Every structure is written in structure tokens, then in C-alpha cells.
């Protein structure tokens, strides 16, 4: 069976620490996803519990992260905070399906460009989510968020193994309460937990038409969650030693999200930062995560009236630094295509404020580049008419085409009089196809050889630029 209770003294303590670090995360992420803090705190609690009992890698905190929230933020403003519940249930179902089929090993196939793009987009979206707290601006907001960043970045060089964010929140709370500062408090953005999570059957979604609208977000949530769980797992593996079955971990994740959805909760996955803070502080048991969730619930129930008094500047500061911690990568001075994928995801997510779309275009772009690495999909065939005129029959789909490969398939050795270019069986899906053909024709014309284009409009009609 191999089930233990080793090192309770350190596991409990670690769980306490990461719980104190867990409260503001869940509250904030709840606000970011346009929902009550209650949902996030509940999520963190129940997920931590179920993962503590059914998780694969002990000492790994699974609660509520932005990686999940920013994928539901669009579902909640279009259908509600409850289509969210359905989506979390279905998400968990997809995860236990993924674990039952034993498919974790395939997570390696996921392009690094897509992932790093997801991270960047995520972080800058966090930072952008902190902006609507500045549109209605009192200078107390600015002063307390600036002093927040200040105390978070300048205090820990003097202090010890206790969070500077803890001191930030406590101090700013005490100040805001005593001085009676005029600023938005957390209790305004949503209701905070006052009791235990009750069994809430998603009474709000309805069968099929619901399925057709929650399936995509459940898919993306599931995949992102399993990726996060995988990498977090492996990092805990490297930090210590284990033969953790990532399939069992995925299953536990699934069940957790399922019952979470059935108890009015958000969607959750593994948390890198808090898992690291945990293992660093001595947490390596399941009791660590259990005590994390439990002490989280107990403490949020204990400090509730004090909790709702916490100024939004503190939490917006904490989010402001968590964003910074998340974004910064290797901004390389490398494969152009992969960079294209990352920047595509980033820019699209930034412009649309939809992380799911960035993920989507990342997937399809990676798929296209893959098809370009693995197959042909287009070939030219030089044919001679009795006139002695070279006619190049371009057949197939042309997207992201390389100009070099296109030029190499044409003969420029002997400048003929006239050359026919047949596009009757071709399809241009990108402006690069155009550009390539242009380089060819420009080369021929510069060489003194005239070009006759055939069956053209059909090929240039498949252009994506036609929207």
C-alpha cells in the first residue's frame, strides 16, 4: 500500500506556511476571473484535500492558479460563474479520462514555444488585470501599492524565513483600518466564505447545449492543468526522489476538480511556486498539502471579518509581483518559427484578452509547422509543350512556404523566351506563397524571360488574408 505519516512536525508547519501564502492567491485569482473569493478559497481547500488523498506526488500543492482562472474569465462574463462549475466538473472528467487511458507520456510532444508563450501571455494578462483597479484612482491606492512593492522587495533582505508579502498585507491592512483610508476593500469585490462548502450540483447548466459551450474550455483547462501538474511533479522529483506515476497524479487531479465543481468551486491545478516554497521549508508528506488546505479553510473562517477589511492595494501589489515573477524568460537575441509561435500567442492574448485563443493559435501554428517538418503538401511538375515552352504545374496546398525551396524547383540556368506558370491545381493560404511566386517571376523577368500565369485566381482565393 505504501502510505505514510513521516515527519508531521515539518509537514504541518510547511502546510501552514503555504496556506498563508495560499489565501491571497485564491482571493485575487477569484477577483481576476470576475467571481467571488469564496469560489477560489473553496477550490483551494477541496482540491488540496482530494489531491492530498489521491495525488501521485506527495508534497505538491494543488490549489487555485491564474493558469486556470484566466481561462474561465471569459466563460463567467458570457454564461456565468456557474457554467464555470460545469466546466470544472467536465474538466475533472477529462483528466480522469486522460489518466485512465495512460497518456501522460504524450505531454512531452507539446511544443516549448506554446508553453513559454502561454506563460508570458498569462503573466502580462495578470498585470493587465491589475489595471482596472487604477482607472478609479485615489492616491492612497498608488501610495499603498508603491509602498507594497517597496516593502515586498526591500524588507526580505533584512528579514528571514517569513514572507515579505505577509508583512505587506498585514501592515497595509492595519494602516488602512487605523488611518481609515478611502480605498476599495476585498469584501466589495465578492463574498468571502462563512461556512463549509456544501454539495452544489451544477443546477445552472443544462445537458447538451451546455456541453457544446463548456467542452472547449474544459479541454484547455484539463490540458493546462495536466501540463502544470506534470512539470511541478517532475520538479519535485528532481528536488528529491520518486517514481511518481503521473497518471495517478492526473487522476487525483481529475477527481479533485470534479468534486470541486460539485461543491461550488473553481478549477485548479499544481502550483510551481508554492510547491517549491513547501519542499524548501521541509514539506515532503501528504499531510503537508492536507494541512495546507485545511489550515487554509480554518484560517479564512477565523479571520473573515478581518479578511474583508484587507485593502485592494495590498493584493494588487502581490499580484503585481507574482506577474513579474511569472513573465521574465530568456528573451533570446534560434528557430524563427518557434519565436513566431510564442510572440503569436502573446500578442493575440494581449489584444483579445483571451488566453484560450492564444493557446488555440499556438496549437494550430505548432501543428502547421509540424506538417511542414513532416510532409510536402505541394509539388511542382515541369512539363514541355510541343512549342518548347516550359510550363511549371504547381499542385498542392501552399502555406508558410520557403522561397528557397520554391526557387530551387525552377530552372534558371538557361534564360528561355517565355515560361508558363500553372497554378490551376495550386492553393495559396498565406502571403508568403504570393511572395515566393513573386520572387520567382521577378527573377525570370530580371533575367529577360517573360512569364505567363495560368489558373491563378483559384489559387490566390484560399488566402487567409481574405479573413
Amino acid at each position, epitope marked *: 500500500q505504501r502510505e505514510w505519516f513521516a515527519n508531521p512536525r515539518k509537514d504541518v508547519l510547511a502546510g501552514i506556511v503555504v496556506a498563508l501564502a495560499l489565501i491571497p492567491e485564491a482571493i485575487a485569482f477569484s477577483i481576476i476571473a470576475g467571481v467571488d473569493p469564496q469560489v477560489g478559497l473553496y477550490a483551494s481547500f477541496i482540491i488540496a484535500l482530494i489531491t492530498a488523498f489521491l495525488g501521485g506526488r506527495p508534497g505538491m500543492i494543488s490549489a487555485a492558479t491564474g493558469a486556470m482562472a484566466l481561462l474561465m474569465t471569459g466563460l463567467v462574463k458570457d454564461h456565468g460563474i456557474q457554467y464555470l462549475f460545469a466546466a470544472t466538473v467536465l474538466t475533472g472528467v477529462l483528466q480522469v479520462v486522460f489518466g485512465w487511458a495512460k497518456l501522460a507520456r504524450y505531454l512531452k510532444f507539446v511544443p516549448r514555444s506554446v508553453m513559454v508563450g502561454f506563460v508570458n501571455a498569462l503573466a502580462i494578462l495578470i498585470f493587465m488585470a491589475q489595471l482596472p483597479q487604477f482607472v478609479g484612482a485615489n492616491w492612497q491606492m498608488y501610495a499603498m501599492v508603491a509602498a507594497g512593492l517597496a516593502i515586498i522587495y526591500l524588507l526580505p533582505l533584512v528579514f528571514k524565513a517569513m514572507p515579505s508579502a505577509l508583512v505587506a498585507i498585514v501592515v497595509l491592512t492595519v494602516v488602512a483600518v487605523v488611518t481609515g483610508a478611502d480605498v476599495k476593500t476585498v469584501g466589495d469585490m465578492g463574498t468571502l466564505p462563512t461556512a463549509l462548502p456544501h454539495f452544489q450540483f451544477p443546477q445552472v447548466p443544462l445537458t447538451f447545449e451546455t456541453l457544446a459551450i463548456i467542452f472547449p474550455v474544459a479541454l484547455t483547462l484539463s490540458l493546462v492543468g495536466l501540463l502544470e501538474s506534470l512539470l511541478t511533479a517532475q520538479l519535485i522529483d528532481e528536488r528529491t526522489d520518486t517514481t511518481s506515476d503521473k497518471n495517478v497524479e492526473s487522476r487525483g487531479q481529475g477527481v479533485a476538480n470534479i468534486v470541486t465543481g460539485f461543491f461550488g468551486g473553481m478549477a485548479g491545478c499544481a502550483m510551481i511556486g508554492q510547491s517549491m516554497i513547501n519542499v524548501t521549508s521541509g514539506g515532503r508528506g501528504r499531510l503537508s498539502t492536507f494541512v495546507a488546505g485545511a489550515f487554509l479553510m480554518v484560517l479564512i473562517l477565523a479571520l473573515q471579518p478581518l479578511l474583508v477589511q484587507i485593502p485592494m492595494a495590498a493584493l494588487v501589489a502581490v499580484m503585481m509581483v507574482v506577474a513579474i515573477s511569472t513573465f521574465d524568460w530568456g528573451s533570446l537575441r534560434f528557430p524563427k518559427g518557434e519565436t513566431v509561435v510564442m510572440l503569436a500567442t502573446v500578442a493575440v492574448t494581449v489584444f483579445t484578452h483571451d488566453l484560450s485563443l492564444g493557446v488555440l493559435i499556438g496549437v494550430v501554428l505548432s501543428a502547421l509547422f509540424f506538417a511542414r517538418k513532416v510532409s510536402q503538401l505541394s509539388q511542382v511538375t515541369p512539363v514541355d509543350e510541343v512549342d518548347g515552352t516550359r510550363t511549371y504545374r504547381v499542385r498542392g496546398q501552399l502555406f508558410f512556404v520557403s522561397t528557397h525551396d520554391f526557387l530551387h524547383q525552377f530552372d534558371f540556368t538557361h534564360p528561355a523566351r517565355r515560361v508558363v506558370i500553372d497554378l490551376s491545381d495550386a492553393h495559396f493560404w498565406d502571403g508568403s506563397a504570393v*511572395g515566393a511566386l513573386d520572387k520567382v*517571376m*521577378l527573377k525570370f*523577368m530580371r533575367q529577360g524571360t517573360s512569364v505567363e*500565369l495560368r489558373g*491563378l*485566381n483559384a489559387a490566390s482565393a484560399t488566402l487567409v488574408e481574405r479573413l
Partner: nanobody
Amino acid sequence: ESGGGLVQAGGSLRLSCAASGSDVMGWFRQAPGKEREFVAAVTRSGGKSYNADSVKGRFTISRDNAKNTVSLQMNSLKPEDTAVYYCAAGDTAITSWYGYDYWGQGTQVTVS
């Protein structure tokens, strides 16, 4: 750009484009309300490029000896040639579409 006017059933018309402002010069035609279409393009070297879909071997492009002039001879016009003919002077690139450095507002060409 100059040469717009009215044409009959099998009539003809030459279109001289002047650049008042340099490898290659082009000509496109825009059907009213419909997607733009390529007509022809000619380089300094002497190489031509036609659109055998819109130009069924009827039209004839040539560059004048003058530095800022390109002529497009148009014969055997038909109801579907009725369009606005734009002259482009983009150089060293995009011989075929989407334009480059210079464009010129097009004139109307109507057949009957």
C-alpha cells in the same frame, strides 16, 4: 497615369502611366465592388508578366524609353474588362501583388 475612356464591342485603347514622383512597373484592374485583379508587369531588363486568366493573350505591356512611363495596350475588350485600371511603380519587389513603394489612383474603363 492617363488613357481612360469609353470603348465599344471590339474596340481598343492604350494606357500610358506617368510617374510624376525603379526596376519593375505593374498594372492591376479593379472590378467595381469585386476583388482587385492583376493585369501585367514589366521590368527594365525587358521581361514581361501577364495574367492569362484576365488577359487571354489580348493585352500587351511595355515600358517606354522615358524614365517615368509605362504603356498597356488593350485590344478586343469585353464586358468583364470593365474596371478601374491602377498603375503601380513598386520596385525590386512584389512584381505580382500587394504593391510596394508607389501607387497611382486609377482611372475608369468602361466597354460596350
